[PDB]
Amino acid sequence: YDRGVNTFSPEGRLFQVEYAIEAIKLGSTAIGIQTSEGVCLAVEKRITSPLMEPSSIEKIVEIDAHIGCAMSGLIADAKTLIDKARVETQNHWFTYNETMTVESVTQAVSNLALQFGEEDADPGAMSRPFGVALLFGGVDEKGPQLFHMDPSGTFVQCDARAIGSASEGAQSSLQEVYHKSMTLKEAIKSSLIILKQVMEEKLNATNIELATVQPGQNFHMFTKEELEEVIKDI
Amino acid sequence: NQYDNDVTVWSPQGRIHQIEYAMEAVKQGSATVGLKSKTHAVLVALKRAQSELAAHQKKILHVDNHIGISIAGLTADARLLCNFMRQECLDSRFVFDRPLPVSRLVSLIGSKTQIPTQRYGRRPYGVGLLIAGYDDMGPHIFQTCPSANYFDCRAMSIGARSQSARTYLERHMSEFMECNLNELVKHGLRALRETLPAEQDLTTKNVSIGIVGKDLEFTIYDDDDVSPFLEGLEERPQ
Amino acid sequence: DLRNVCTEAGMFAIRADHDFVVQEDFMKAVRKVADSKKLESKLDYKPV
Amino acid sequence: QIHSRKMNVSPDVNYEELARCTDDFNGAQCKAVCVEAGMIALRRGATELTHEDYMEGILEVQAKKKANLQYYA
Amino acid sequence: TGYDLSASTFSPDGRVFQVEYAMKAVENSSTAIGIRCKDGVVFGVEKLVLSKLYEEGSNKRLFNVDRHVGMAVAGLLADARSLADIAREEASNFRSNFGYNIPLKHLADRVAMYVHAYTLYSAVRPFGCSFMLGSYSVNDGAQLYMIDPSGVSYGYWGCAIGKARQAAKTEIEKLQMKEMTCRDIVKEVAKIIYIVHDEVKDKAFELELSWVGELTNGRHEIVPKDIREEAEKYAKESLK
Amino acid sequence: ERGYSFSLTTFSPSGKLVQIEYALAAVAGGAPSVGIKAANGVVLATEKKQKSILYDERSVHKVEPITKHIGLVYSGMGPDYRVLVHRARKLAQQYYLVYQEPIPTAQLVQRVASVMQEYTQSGGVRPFGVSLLICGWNEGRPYLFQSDPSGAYFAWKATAMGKNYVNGKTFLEKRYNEDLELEDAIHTAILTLKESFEGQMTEDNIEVGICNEAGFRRLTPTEVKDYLAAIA
Amino acid sequence: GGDNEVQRTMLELINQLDGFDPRGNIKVLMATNRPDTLDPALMRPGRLDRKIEFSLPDLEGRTHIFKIHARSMSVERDIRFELLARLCPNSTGAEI
Amino acid sequence: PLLHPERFVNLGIEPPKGVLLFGPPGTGKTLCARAVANRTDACFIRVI
Amino acid sequence: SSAGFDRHITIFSPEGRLYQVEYAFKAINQGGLTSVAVRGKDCAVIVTQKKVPDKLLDSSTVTHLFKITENIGCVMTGMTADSRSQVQRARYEAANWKYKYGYEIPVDMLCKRIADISQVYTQNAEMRPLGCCMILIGIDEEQGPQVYKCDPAGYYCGFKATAAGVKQTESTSFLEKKVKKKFDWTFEQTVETAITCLSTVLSIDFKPSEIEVGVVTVENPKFRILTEAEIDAHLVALAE
Ligand SMILES: Nc1ncnc2c1ncn2[C@@H]1O[C@H](COP(=O)(O)OP(=O)(O)OP(=O)(O)O)[C@@H](O)[C@H]1O
């Protein structure tokens, strides 16, 4: 009843990777939308006690001056991945002197996913595959770019992604409100509508978080002052 | 069934089950076709996507000016191998200053992937590489498998529901000895059209074509200039 | 087993309609029986 | 070719392919294909059996487990 | 039970089971024959045609390890290729260390010891191929050797491996091979191959032949196309 | 290659090391032996008996001299006794190369027991199967020691290890005392080896070694034949 | 000998369904929890033609089980069970 | 097949004879058997 | 009698035994051969049998005897590959001894070192304890001839007359009864006794093409293999 971490199933799929895929369903939801105007990211927090400090827990964290990341699932381990992303970007800038596309960073990270190996090397990021699901949002020369990365090592560019426990409902409902002539404000409004609809508890200006990136300025996130404008204007 | 937990063990009938399982995993990918003419080699791939608003997964990769590959399986191992291919070709060019012949490279791949299927607690690589290249002896089509075994072929098709396409290739086998690129690629697409159900077919967003030839370097066409190839194709009889 | 050898060497002649045996059929039979006994146990056993 | 002898099979099957698509099937399974593929057609109320029904039957009697998402290729 | 799992545990009756499983793995390969003549040896391989798409000359089962030694294999192709590579490396290493072509009686031993190293520890598995080595030297005569997965190296006047080993070696022994030179041996080999693998089991196949001896200045190589054409034409008459 | 890197002897639910106990049970089935000392020297006696007349008893020995003044005998498994003897020789040389002085017996015993115990906590091995008796004569006072697969060591005045060893202990208690002679020691040791000896006692089936404040020696068959005579 | 008698029982059951003029107009129907231990000769078709499989409910399964097992309740008229379905990832009908 | 024993006989098929139900505990197979027992008309012998 | 993993690895049984070594000894008998060795007054002789089931096999390459050193010979029993490995180990060890100390190795020390090497295998939990037994004959100065035997468990010893194989027990009985005569020994007597012992145990009355003999004498310590002619001479002279 005990097998190594490197076993193939009688139908061809791996065991550990399938289990991690099933495990990322225990995290909070997260929704990302890309528009020619810019990219927007929204996340929940799942506050449990009034002694929570809501500003202490964060999901969106920048990778550089123009790349943002959204995380779901477990959190404790993702710090390593974020760190390697930042170090790689700065190393590339040091060696070559330019800015990298979000695609190159995405695959440069994804090559790190499948490394668990019981035998062989010295201490490795072994034991298990990482349990986090990531959205990458950036603005490069070809406009805004949104990518989705998965524990199996597969990355793909999407237009409207929803990941987390309530992913299915968000994805199902999101198809009927998107098209290519989209604008930033109404995009953010529709995203907020979806989040509030699938929320568990009540909605306020501290239970959610948003961030936006446009070709003009850098990565910028809203605080508790400009966030309620769209809430009252729902 | 305790004979089914590690590479090292041998079944009573003398068939290790891990390798059979890896082959079965390779049969999970999307279809792909490859074939050769007298002086050109063409490989065709059909793509896949999850939701209507997500981009299609890419299949064909660029190895070197005279060598291209197609992939079916899980992608991480695919990248792990492509890096090796690039490294070796660059090394040969740097030292001996000449293109690396395809067969020597394929032998290197076989020797490399054989090692893990023998030690303890090491899995095999799950990929279904199709190699298309041009050398001093002309075109070349090769296929590998997770069992560290490779074959030389003149027309091969792999992936889920690749059997009907293989039968079609077998039927029209001779005429490849006189056709040119214009009709060669049309034959390849005709072959690929059989492995689809009776509701949807080619729409220029699910097709990718790679060509190498005696006087043409390995080129990839996808989603735009593909319409010139596709147009003029007879409809599926019903 | 040797009775069996002497039987098979005749069986190989009942077909091909030879009413006489010749030395090649003994070779055939001996090798044919030689490989069929690879599934007995070959433990001797002893009273004690 | 033996067992499907009675039902009104259309003149379009290609047993030389089906035999190559089956692997490790023993004889009884190769029988069972010929009945499953006879039931599939009646499910859709058609008359003659057709090739695709045989392919469906094959995909049945392997009895492979649920595979959820397919993220390969 | 559970005594047949690893290759480190003896059965109560006193034998290792994994090696026996490997040998049973060998007994499903196609077939190969090799016989010695007055002044050389001749190999012969029959390759089944799995499907029409493959080419002739694919997946060669005859490997020329050195400039003067030939190898024929039966089992799993990948393991055969790896063993061929290690043998070739051993030959080159020996030439560099000392400075002349290695004799058979040493090369076969080195390969045998290296193979036998894969049947003690539990961290590896035994190989799955059985092979034959042949060569000729002007000052050494004609040498033939056969090696199995267990690690046993033996010398033969002529032997055969594969499915129908017994059937083939029935007719191997009838020929008077002590004297007659191996220019007419080739016809005998074609005849002895065409009398096995009935058409009921499979429809069509192809044939490979090799060559070594002072007839070709001791080098080892492949036979010319016309010679095998004549041999096949001749063996077409033996079916009567 | 690579070993296993996890020990095979672990605490049982009642807190008892199973492997070391099984090793002791195996030790109890070896060839019997006895050891005595009295105020002038030390005597070790052990029994050997070849199965058939074909064996050349002149080729192997039980009593092995480590140095000119230290003696060792064993009870239990056959082969690994040689390994332990070799290690003891090596330790003796290593010590002598520092202080230019023969090793005192206590230090030798401590080091050997250290090795024997260390061997039960390493990776992928099983302990030895021997019980050792060590004799020496340094600084006038004679010394006797007995080790154990567990690594514990004791100092005994006279003891017996092997088959039916409890009866040997009782008999020695009923006979041994504090003031004797070397010759009487030899006679009583031979007598207690004859408690359950074989069918007949000869001069080649008994191995006896002595060590006095003059040195350690192994007795030749002539004196063994004489001592077996005028006895029993 | 171990389980020999039970093995003879199993063999008789097997034999009753195959070989020499079978039963004809009789249909069987079986169930189990850990089917990996079933014997190959019993799972061969001609005896167990279909291998229906029951898996853990997905999402319409969970909301629908709630609808069925709670439709005889005196509860509030404005609660949503979809959230309840989301809150329990892999669970059986028993838990509902 | 029991309540419409003409379609299969007319067209020329014989329906299967067995079925196995498996899954983790608590999933609900025994309940399916009860449903079948409630619906039917011919006899029905239960054995454990 | 056992619980846990006593039947799979070399660990102690509850009763004090260990089975993975006791299995190698019965693994010895799988080949089905027997050898006998005798020590004379100033000579040493070894006799073995060889079996060649088919004509295709080259009869000149199945010798079980090997030449370790110009003064020391060995004879093999048991499996094949393990035998070759142990032989190579012995040759290498003797050559290293010669390099290191500058004079020839006595037979006893060599046997001790090979047995000690075997002993480690029964101490760890990764290897198999090499099921093949060893017999050595040599001459030592100031000691005459000497005959030693080494077993898989690591128990080496010097004998006066020994037999290894399927029929060990009855052969030892016969040798004991014969050696009880307590008489002088010469070369002819030694060879005649060694031949007739095996002859009566197997009850064959053989031909000179089935038995191999090795000897060493104190006039020319070079170990040598007897030619078939003088073997026939001994054999016919024995039958009065
Ligand atoms: N689809 C379903 N619809 C309604 N209730 C269900 C469903 N699946 C399971 N249940 C409930 O869960 C329980 C299922 O247990 P049941 O007695 O049927 O056993 P089982 O799952 O068939 O097998 P086992 O006896 O091995 O546990 C029942 O109480 C039933 O009410």
Ligand SMILES: [Mg+2]
């Ligand atoms: Mg139940």
